[PDB]
Amino acid sequence: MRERIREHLSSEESVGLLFSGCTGINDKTLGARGGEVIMVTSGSGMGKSTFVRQQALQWGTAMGKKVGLAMLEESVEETAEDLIGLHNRVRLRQSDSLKREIIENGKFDQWFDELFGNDTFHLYDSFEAETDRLLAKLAYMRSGLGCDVIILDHISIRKMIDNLMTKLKGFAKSTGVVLVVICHLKSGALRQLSDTIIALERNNLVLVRILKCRFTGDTGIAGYMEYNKETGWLEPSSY
Amino acid sequence: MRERIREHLSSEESVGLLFSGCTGINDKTLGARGGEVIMVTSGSGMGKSTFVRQQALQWGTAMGKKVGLAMLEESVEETAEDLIGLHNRVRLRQSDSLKREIIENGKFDQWFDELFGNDTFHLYDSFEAETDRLLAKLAYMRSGLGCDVIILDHISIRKMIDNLMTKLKGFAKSTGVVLVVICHLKSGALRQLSDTIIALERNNLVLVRILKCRFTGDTGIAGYMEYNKETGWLEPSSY
Amino acid sequence: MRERIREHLSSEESVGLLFSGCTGINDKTLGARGGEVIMVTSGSGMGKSTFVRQQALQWGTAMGKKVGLAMLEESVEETAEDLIGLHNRVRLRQSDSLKREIIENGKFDQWFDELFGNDTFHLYDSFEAETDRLLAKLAYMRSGLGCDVIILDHISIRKMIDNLMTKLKGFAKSTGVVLVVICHLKSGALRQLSDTIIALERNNLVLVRILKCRFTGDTGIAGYMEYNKETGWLEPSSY
Amino acid sequence: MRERIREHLSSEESVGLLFSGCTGINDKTLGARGGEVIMVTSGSGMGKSTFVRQQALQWGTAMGKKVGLAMLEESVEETAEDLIGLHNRVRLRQSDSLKREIIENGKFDQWFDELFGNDTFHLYDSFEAETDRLLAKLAYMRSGLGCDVIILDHISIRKMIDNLMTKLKGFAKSTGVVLVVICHLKSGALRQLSDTIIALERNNLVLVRILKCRFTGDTGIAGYMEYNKETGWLEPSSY
Amino acid sequence: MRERIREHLSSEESVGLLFSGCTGINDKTLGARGGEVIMVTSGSGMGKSTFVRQQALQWGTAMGKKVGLAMLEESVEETAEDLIGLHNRVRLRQSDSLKREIIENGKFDQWFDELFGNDTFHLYDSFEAETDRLLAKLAYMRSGLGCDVIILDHISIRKMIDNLMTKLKGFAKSTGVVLVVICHLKSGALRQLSDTIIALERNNLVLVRILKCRFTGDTGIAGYMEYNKETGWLEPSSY
Amino acid sequence: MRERIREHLSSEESVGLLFSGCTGINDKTLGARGGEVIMVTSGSGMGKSTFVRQQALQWGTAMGKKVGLAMLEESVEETAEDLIGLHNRVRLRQSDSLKREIIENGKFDQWFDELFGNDTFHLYDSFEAETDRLLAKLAYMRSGLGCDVIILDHISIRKMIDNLMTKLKGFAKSTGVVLVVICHLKSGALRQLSDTIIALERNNLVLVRILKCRFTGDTGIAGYMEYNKETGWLEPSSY
Ligand SMILES: Nc1ncnc2c1ncn2[C@H]1C[C@H](O)[C@@H](COP(=O)(O)OP(=O)(O)OP(=O)(O)O)O1
Ligand SMILES: Nc1ncnc2c1ncn2[C@H]1C[C@H](O)[C@@H](COP(=O)(O)OP(=O)(O)OP(=O)(O)O)O1
Ligand SMILES: Nc1ncnc2c1ncn2[C@H]1C[C@H](O)[C@@H](COP(=O)(O)OP(=O)(O)OP(=O)(O)O)O1
Ligand SMILES: Nc1ncnc2c1ncn2[C@H]1C[C@H](O)[C@@H](COP(=O)(O)OP(=O)(O)OP(=O)(O)O)O1
Ligand SMILES: Nc1ncnc2c1ncn2[C@H]1C[C@H](O)[C@@H](COP(=O)(O)OP(=O)(O)OP(=O)(O)O)O1
Ligand SMILES: Nc1ncnc2c1ncn2[C@H]1C[C@H](O)[C@@H](COP(=O)(O)OP(=O)(O)OP(=O)(O)O)O1
């Protein structure tokens, strides 16, 4: 047992992928570990996507991880637009002007390559009510595209949901990828199968509440973020 | 994806029909886009109709758009009276004198033609508690009369309301028309199905609050307007 | 629509029964129209009755309208006494002397006939907590006595009040009579069902505040009146 | 109605018990009528008691009315002392000398009989925080002792006060006695239930302010009185 | 009541301990009665202490009363020094010479015995912010030392002050001792709980103003005193 | 019977192994007696393991008892890690840093020996759906390893469960060991065969509810504990 515990102690990854933008999230969660499913929730339009997109951007650009993004609602172009804008601290969607300027200026092409040049991000859309068709694509993003993190955006709150979540967790646990699923709050396996659940609350000062973190057991409010309506980034707040 | 994003970027209508009279509304909303439902609310007699009528007048006269107005409460004659007065910066209802003068003077006929001469405005009244009868007329105002904007005045705050709002949003999203619905605040799908919600607050200095704007996410108070009791127009305020 | 709007324009009664004694009331309200309920309020002993009685006297004497007065608190004799005194610019209640003089002098009889001779005023008292018994009498004062205006004095600030106000407005709207209700301020449907609300404020210089006027939307203070403790009349003030 | 109004006019008591000492009080109030509650107030030691005692003395001696005095604070002996002194234009309390002289001289006995000989005044003390015990005694002073006026001295500014005032007014209104209550100002039903409120103001020149008079509506300052420190009487002032 | 009033009249102490030095004080106050609290006030160094000390000296020497003096600021020795000097019409504090002469001359001892020999005066110092500790000592000076008058020197202008004054008045009223409290003017219960308030005003010609006297109601200026800088006595002035 | 009852009275173990950390548990249970099965339950991640591990640590270190721990879910290394951290008031799992520091520093080895040096704790993992294979190991931990207490972590809520619980209780009753079984609440013999059932409730303030205690019959809430997220210990709370 002695040598058995030692090797155990010197090989256990307690700290996972670090989150960004919210002083406190890491304190209460220790980051996202591989094999865990991260649930991010809150009311519609409350900021789930942005928050997750922001983490996706950092993990993939700063942490050198390959991120896969599977969109159920919006298209790749839309997601790409958001990612590109985010990376350049600008909101492409909110400005027909900048959008047209970026094409002729040749900045779009430069921006596209600066972000997607390498094989870091993998965006997939076109996701029917079939779990198995979905799981197959997820597993390919892992095995074939070597994604470290896979974000699933998104799902709405049971057989279906239950079986999906059960298949999602199994997939996560067996491959060791980090799965972050965004879900809308307008449930059962949701709370059970998820390892960590993050909820965003508002009323641009967003309160980040840790509804659950298996690994740490530390729940409660992690901190506050402030949305910069100009850059589109969620920033840490001195609240 | 590159060429896929490019065409996406050079074909996305971010800025919709511009609002008028309130320095700030456009800043926080980017105008009214086609396919979206605009909710305008506030207490009774607080100024919803006027505000919407004013936007209707500009969109149809200045923007060259065809506007349809479906009245559930008041009649066409009443609405027309308001539109005509508005256009001529005069309050016909508040003056038996001007009303009688306008007939003999021949100005009424001249004013009527100057406003309704073209096929720009389409007023319909005579709207029973049947949604389907209503939706049918709306769809005709779009397809048959080619309205760019349809204003529904009005509705009072669930099956009925819920199904109506769900049918209204579906209609809006599928045709691409801009639907602005006025509703009284003395709800469920109301907040959910609406893309942008504008609330007017008073105590003639009216505060315009953006309760919700999907497209932009920018909420809060857009600005202040001042009602000119002489012309009947809501004017921008230096508050 | 053209000919439809024309006839509409040349048949709309914008200006109703003109108020008297307060330079400004008419400006902000355009008078009392038939079918509307006028609410007159303020603290006890603040002057509601006098003010309304004064309007009643003018409408019935000068405007040639038949006025019905339904008293819930005071008796017909009391009301009559006030009306008679008002008409003769004298306060009968404040002088046992004049009261006794008026009988022997034969002036009372002359004064009574000069005011009540014709069928202009209809005073009814003896109004139990039954709305339906009340509404029945009101409807008779309209249909049977042909009253143009009916004053209800008075009511104290909900089922009861709510249902009463809802029945009062329905009665007013359906018959087209002008209903002026006096209410004490020491509410719900009160503010909602009332078309115009007039509030009197003091500390004999009375401030007349227009708390609400559907038809015009013009609110605020209409002007100031001065109570003549000698004649009992509320007079216009140069404040 | 004619004969109904006539009898009404020739049977209405507008002028009540006349006040004394203050040229103007009667002008603004028309005296104290039966069934009304008179509130007399002002700061402690400002002169309420004296003023009321003075009215009590006149009503009972000159007007031939039976006056009941219910004291909550001071004793009968004290009150009697004040009444006796007042009647003889002398301040018994301020002079041990006169007090001792009046006994041997036989004047006390003569003075006592000259004031209390008849059954005009009824002094009662010994008034616990029980309203019902109080009301019972009041009703007896009316029915049993036939008092025309009952003075309650005194009360300090709510259930208790509210219920008391409500019971006081009910008692007054139902029996027709004149109730004058003295209250200290260092309120709710006080202002509401009282028919006339008299306030005394100083800095021996006392300003008499009519804070309220239902019957007449005439408020404001009635006049000025001057306290004669030698006789103890409040006299009319030429201010 | 007759015999009840008689005994009342022949047992009422209207005239209390007579004041000295100011022709007029007694006229407006009738002296200090037992059970009353006398407030003596004015600006610092204006002469409160002297004035009160002077009254204390007379009451105790001439009137044969036992006087207790409770000092909050100065010590017993200081107070004694002032009393001794006062009694001998000399200012001990202003003369190191006389002070040294009085010891050897044996006059001090003779003067001490001539003043304090009997058990007439009781000086106590050493009075912490505790009311209850203070009240206990006061009650002992009354009950145990049999003081007729207790002077409290002094207090500075609320819970504390309010509760103290309320406890002081209660103590005074319940025992019947005469309490004279000196207070500094640089309030609430002060004016209320005090029975008589005397204020000294200057610019050695001191104006004595009676700010309040419950018992008599006679306020205003009582008279003028002149300070003899040689004897330390306040003398009556012919102003 | 007399001598029969006496020896019975002087040989009955009413108080068993005392629990720790929760002021009240012992009051309502009198501790854990040999031959009884203790059920500890609550929702997942609610704190069962920690609580039991804490009791295990004390029983084995302070009470000098030999504790056996049979893990069905986690491994020995994991359990050992928790025990070691607990003993040193530190959370090894939550800190890659401390984990690496403890190896080189030589503290791990020192900590391991300080806890496991003696033959006090017996951890066994690797527990298939076979009851009989399980019971065999349990019986060996008792007979062969001489464990006083055996903790079974854990079981999820019937033949299987029923037969297992029936075999567990039989084992406990026949050997006299103290068996504490942890079970998840997301039943039949569970409630029946268990002698004492402890439930933990949260929302780090944990409510300890005694759902059942045969021996005492005292049920209800024993008290509150507070989780120290820094040391990993459940502490008594002053709630
Ligand atoms: N009361 C508590 N407050 C906060 N965190 C706690 C508390 N109790 C335990 N934890 C933390 C420490 C662990 O990392 C995590 C889970 O505790 P644990 O005892 O393993 O729960 P459990 O045994 O009831 O659940 P399960 O076996 O079902 O996963 O949460
Ligand atoms: N905290 C915030 N403050 C202000 N605007 C925000 C905030 N977060 C996001 N937004 C803006 C940017 C977007 O245009 C819009 C919606 O954000 P988004 O992340 O798409 O919400 P969501 O993903 O939670 O909602 P849903 O998927 O349900 O529509 O609002
Ligand atoms: N801001 C304003 N200040 C003053 N008057 C106004 C204002 N807005 C509108 N009005 C006037 C003009 C109209 O005669 C009247 C009512 O306006 P309107 O737009 O019809 O209110 P609304 O549509 O919100 O109420 P509703 O439908 O519930 O009766 O008040
Ligand atoms: N503005 C005024 N100034 C002075 N006296 C007034 C004024 N208005 C009315 N009065 C006088 C005349 C009446 O005798 C008395 C009460 O007037 P009244 O109209 O009966 O008040 P009100 O109807 O508001 O009160 P309520 O019904 O609650 O008793 O006061
Ligand atoms: N009227 C006066 N004219 C001149 N000197 C006076 C007069 N009264 C008192 N003094 C002198 C004697 C003392 O040495 C000094 C202060 O008198 P004192 O009675 O102690 O004042 P005070 O008691 O009002 O003030 P405090 O307690 O606030 O210091 O002034
Ligand atoms: N106007 C006055 N001027 C001077 N002294 C007056 C005046 N009125 C009354 N007094 C005197 C006579 C009394 O001895 C004393 C108090 O009068 P009193 O009527 O008892 O006051 P009050 O009844 O208002 O006060 P309270 O009941 O609160 O003590 O003052």
Q: How far is C176 from chain D (nearest CA, A)?
A: 29
Give the pair of three-digit tokens for residue A110.
């430069």
CA-wise closest residue to D122 among D105, D141, D103, D140: D141
Which residues contact residue A42 at a Cβ distance below 8 angstroms, ignoring those fewer than 6 apart? A48, A185, A199, A200, A201, A202
- Structural domain boundaries of chain B? 1-239
Chain B CB within 8 Å of residue C45 CB: no
Q: What residue has token string 């008419």?
A: C26
Contact at 8 Å (CB) between A212 and A197? yes
For the CA of C206, the closest atom of ligand 4 is 1
Strands (E), F43-97: 67-71
Please answer yes or no on whether D217 and C123 come within 8 Å at the CB atom: no
**Contact: B2, A109; criterion CB under 8 Å:** yes
C-alpha distance from residue B74 to each of B58, B80, B123, C103, E94 (Å): 21, 10, 11, 56, 98
In sequence order, which residues have a C-beta less than 8 Å from that of residue B211 and are 6 or more positions away? B41, B197, B198, B199, B219
Q: Among residues C18, C36, C19, C6, which one has the least CA distance to residue C150?
A: C36
Distance CA A182, CA A200 (A): 11
**Structure token pair of residue D36:** 């009304």
Q: Cβ contacts (< 8 Å) between E191 and chain D: which residues?
A: none
Pairing assessment for the beta strands C205-213 and C196-201 based on DSSP bridges: antiparallel
The structure tokens listed for D170 are 């009910």
CA-CA distances (angstroms) from residue D121 to D53, D111, D115, D117?
11, 14, 8, 9
Give contacts of B112 with chain C, Cβ < 8 Å: 2, 5
Picking from B69, B72, B74, the residue whose alpha carbon sits closest to that of residue B52 is B69
Q: Which residues of F touch A10 (CB under 8 A)?
A: 99-100, 103
| Vertex D212 angle, CA D206 and D216, to 5° | 110
CA distances from F155 to A67, C201, F19, F42 (A): 38, 77, 22, 12
**How close, in Å, is residue D147 to chain C by CA atoms?**
24
Three-class SS state of C217: coil
Alpha-carbon span A143 to A137, nearest angstrom: 10
Among A71, A50, A59, A61, residue whose Cα is nearest residue A32: A59
Instruction: Return the number of other C-beta atoms located less than 10 Å from residue E17's C-beta.
Output: 21
User: Which element (helix H / strand E) includes C47?
Assistant: none
Give the method of determination: X-ray
Please, are residues E139 and E70 in contact by the beta-carbon 8 Å criterion?
A: no
> Order of strands across the sheet with C178-184?
C121-124, C67-71, C149-156, C178-184, C37-42, C196-201, C205-213, C220-227, C234-236
**Contact of C137 with C124, CB cutoff 8 Å:** yes
Quote the CA–CA distance of C105 and C82 in Å, as a whole number.
19
- Enumerate residues preceding breaks in chain F (C to N > 2.5 Å): 127, 157, 186, 203
What is the largest distance, in Å, between two alpha-carbon atoms of chain A? 67
| CB proximity under 8 Å: D 158-197 to C | 192
Give the residue whose CA is nearest to atom 13 of ligand 2.
B217
Helix (H) or strand (E) holding F109: helix F107-116
User: Which protein residue has the closest C-alpha to ligand 5 atom 7?
Assistant: E47
Burial D47-61 (b: 16+ CB within 10 A, else e): bbbbbbbbbbbbbbb
The pair phi, psi for residue F221, each rounded to 5°, is -85, 125
Q: CA-CA distance, B134 to B157, in Å (whole number)?
A: 17
CA distances from E197 to E32, E172, E202 (A): 11, 15, 17
Question: What spatial distance separates the first Cα and last Cα of chain B, rounded to whole Å?
Answer: 48
Q: Do chains D and C touch (3 or more CB pairs under 8 A)?
A: yes
| Max CA pair span of chain E | 67
Distance C29 CA to ligand 3 centre (A): 14
Whether chain C has a CB inside 8 Å of the CB on D212: the answer is yes
With contacts defined as CB-CB under 8 Å, which chain D residues touch C101? none
Cα D53 from Cα D35, distance rounded (Å)? 20
Is residue F200 within 8 A of residue F47, CB to CB? The reply is yes
Give how far Cα A38 sits from Cα of A34, A169, A215, E3, Å: 10, 10, 12, 97
Cα–Cα distance, F228 to B62 (Å, whole number): 68
Between β-strands D178-184 and D149-156, what pairing exists: parallel, antiparallel or unpaired? parallel
The DSSP secondary structure of A58-112, one letter per residue, reads: HHHHTS---EEEEESSS-HHHHHHHHHHHHTT--GGG-HHHHHHHHHTSHHHHHH
- Cα–Cα distance, C212 to C218 (Å, whole number): 7
Angstrom distance (rounded) from CA F145 to CA F139: 9
| DSSP tag of A214 | T
Q: Cα(B207)–Cα(B22) distance, rounded to whole angstroms?
A: 10
Q: At what angle do helices F76-87 and F107-116 cross, to 10 degrees?
A: 100
Determine the residue of chain F that is closest to A218 in CA distance.
Answer: F229
Is F1-239 CATH 3.40.50.300? yes
Q: Is C42 annotated as a binding residue?
A: yes
- Centroid of ligand 6 to alpha carbon of D125 (angstroms): 19
Closest CA to D181 of D223, D138, D217, D121: D138
H-type alpha helices, E148-210: 159-175, 188-193
CA distances from F60 to A61, C40, F106, F153 (A): 51, 85, 24, 17
- Contact by Cβ (8 Å): E185, E155: no
* Strand ordering across the sheet containing B205-213: B121-124, B67-71, B149-156, B178-184, B37-42, B196-201, B205-213, B220-227, B234-236
B47 labeled binding residue: yes
Task: For residue C231, give the DSSP letter.
Answer: T
Torsion sign over Cα C6, C12, C15, C17: positive
Nearest ligand 6 atom to the CA of D43 is: 24
Task: Read off φ and ψ for residue A168, nearest 5 degrees.
Answer: -70, -45
DSSP state of B144: T
Ligand 3 pocket check for B117: Cβ under 6 Å: no
User: In chain F, which ranges are E strands?
Assistant: 37-42, 67-71, 121-124, 149-156, 178-184, 196-201, 205-213, 220-227, 234-236
Note the Cα A101 to chain centre separation in Å. 30
Q: Which residues pair with D180 in a beta bridge?
A: D38, D151
Query: Which residues of C are less than 8 Å from D215 in CB distance?
Result: 93
| Residue located nearest, by CA, to atom 10 of ligand 4 | D217
* Residues in CB range of E62: below 8 A, 6 or more apart: none
Q: Which atom of ligand 2 is nearest to the CA of B214?
A: 15
Q: Find out whether the beta carbon of A91 lies less than 6 Å from any atom of ligand 2.
A: no
Give CA C136 to chain center in angstroms. 19
* Non-local CB neighbours of E176 within 8 Å, separated by 6+ positions: E34, E35
Contact in structure between E216 and E14 (CB atoms under 8 Å): no
What is the enclosing helix (H) or strand (E) of F93? none
Residue F95 Ramachandran class (φ > 0 left, ψ -120 to 50 alpha, else beta): beta
Chains D and E touch (3+ CB pairs under 8 A): yes
Report the binding-site residues of F: 42-49
Residue C211 near residue C197 (C-beta atoms within 8 A)? yes
Q: How far is the CA of D50 from the centre of ligand 6 (A)?
A: 6
**If DSSP codes are grouped into helix, strand and coil, which group holds residue C145?**
coil
Q: At F174, is the secondary structure helix, strand, or coil?
A: helix
Instruction: Count CA within 13 A, CB hemisphere, residue C152.
Output: 26
In residues, how long is chain A? 239
Give the Cβ contact number of residue F15 at 10 Å.
11
Contact between F198 and F211 under an 8 Å Cβ cutoff? The reply is yes
Q: Do residues A151 and A56 touch, judged by C-beta distance below 8 A? A: yes
The strand pair at D178-184 and E178-184 is best described as unpaired
A46: which DSSP letter? Answer: S
Q: Residue A8 is nearest to which of F81, F95, F96, comparing CB atoms?
A: F81
Q: Which of E18, E13, E40, E39 is nearest to E28 (CA)?
A: E18
Using alpha carbons, select from A46, A14, A45 the residue that is nearest to residue A32.
Answer: A14
SS3 C152: strand
Helix H, strand E, coil C: the string for F119-167 is CCEEEECCCCCCHHHHHHHHHHHHHCCCCCEEEEEEEECCHHHHHHHHH
Does the beta carbon of F119 lie under 8 angstroms from any beta carbon of chain A? Answer: no
Ligand 2 close to Cβ of residue B14 (< 6 A): no
DSSP 8-state code for residue A189: H
Mutate to test the interface with C, among B79, B94, B122 (most CBs of C within 10 A): B94
D143: left (phi over 0), alpha (psi -120 to 50) or beta: alpha
* Element holding E18 (H helix, E strand): none
> Which residues make Cβ contacts (< 8 Å) with residue D16, sequence separation at least 6?
D30, D31, D32, D33, D34, D36, D178
**Please, which residues have CB within 8 angstroms of residue E110's CB and are 6 or more apart in sequence?**
none
Phi/psi for B92 (5° steps) reads -55, -45
CA distances from D87 to D58, D75, D231, E190 (A): 9, 18, 9, 35
Q: How many Å is the Cα radius of gyration of chain C?
A: 18
Amino acid at F71: M
Q: Tell me the C-alpha distance between D215 and D36, whole Å.
A: 9
Tokens of A29: 């969660």
Instruction: Give residue D141's identity as a one-letter amino acid code.
Output: M
Name the DSSP class of B86: H
Written as one letter, the residue type at A91 is R
Q: What is the distance between the alpha carbons of residues B216 and B199, in angstroms, rounded to a whole number?
A: 17
Closest by CA position to C40, among listed C161, C192, C188, C153: C153
- Find out whether F197 and F165 touch, Cβ atoms under 8 Å: no
CB C210 within 8 A of CB C218: yes
- Find, among E191, E4, E161, the residue nearest to D78 by Cα: E4
| Dihedral of alpha carbons F51, F54, F60, F65, sign | negative
Which residues partner with B183 through β-bridges? B41, B155
Using CB distances shorter than 6 Å, the residues near ligand 6 are: D 42, 44-50, 184, 202, 204, 206, 227; E 216-217
- Side-chain-facing half-sphere of E223: CA atoms under 13 Å: 18
Structure tokens at B214: 């999907």
Q: Is the CB of B25 under 6 A from ligand 3?
A: no
For residues C75 and C82, is the Cβ–Cβ distance under 8 A?
no
Which chains does F contact via 3+ CB–CB distances below 8 A?
A: A
Report the b/e string of E57-67 with b at 16+ CB within 10 A: bbbbbeeebbb
Cβ–Cβ below 8 Å for C45 and D214: yes
Residue pair B91/C12 in contact (Cβ under 8 Å)? The answer is no
Q: From C227, C234, C230, C233, select the one nearest C98 (Cα to Cα).
A: C230
Cβ atoms of C127 and C71 within 8 Å: the answer is: yes
Question: How long is chain D?
Answer: 239
Compute the distance between CA of residue D85 and CA of residue D229 in angstroms, rounded to an integer. 12
Given in angstroms, what resolution was this structure solved at? 2.3
CB atoms within 10 A of CB B113: 11
Q: Do B8 and A44 touch (CB under 8 A)?
A: no
Cβ atoms of C55 and C67 closer than 8 Å: no
Nearest to C6 among B78, B96, B108 (CB): B108
Q: How far apart are CA C198 and CA C209, in angstroms?
A: 6
Does the Cβ of B206 fall within 6 Å of ligand 3?
yes
3-state SS string over E92-107?
Answer: HHHCHHHHHHHHHCCH
Whether the CB of B11 is below 8 Å from some CB of chain A: the reply is no
- Residue C184, C-beta contacts closer than 8 angstroms, at least 6 positions apart: C41, C43, C44, C48, C154, C155, C156, C157
Nearest to A180 by CA among A63, A52, A74: A52
DSSP secondary structure letters along chain D: -HHHHHHHHTT---S-BPP-S-TTHHHHH-SBPTT-EEEEEESTTSSHHHHHHHHHHHHHHTS---EEEEESSS-HHHHHHHHHHHHTT--GGG-HHHHHHHHHTSHHHHHHHHHHSSS-EEEE------HHHHHHHHHHHHHTT--SEEEEEEEE--HHHHHHHHHHHHHHHHH--EEEEEEE---HHHHHH-SEEEEEE---EEEEEEEEETTT---EEEEEEEE-TTT--EEE---
Going by the DSSP 8-state scheme, the letter that residue B194 receives in this structure is: -
Sign (positive/negative) of CA torsion A150, A154, A157, A160?
Answer: negative
* CA–CA separation, D87 and D97 (whole Å): 18
Beta bridge partners of A212: A197
SS3 C72: coil
Give the Cα separation of C153 and C47 in Å (integer): 12
In chain F, what is the straight-line distance between the N-terminal and C-terminal CA atoms, in Å? 48
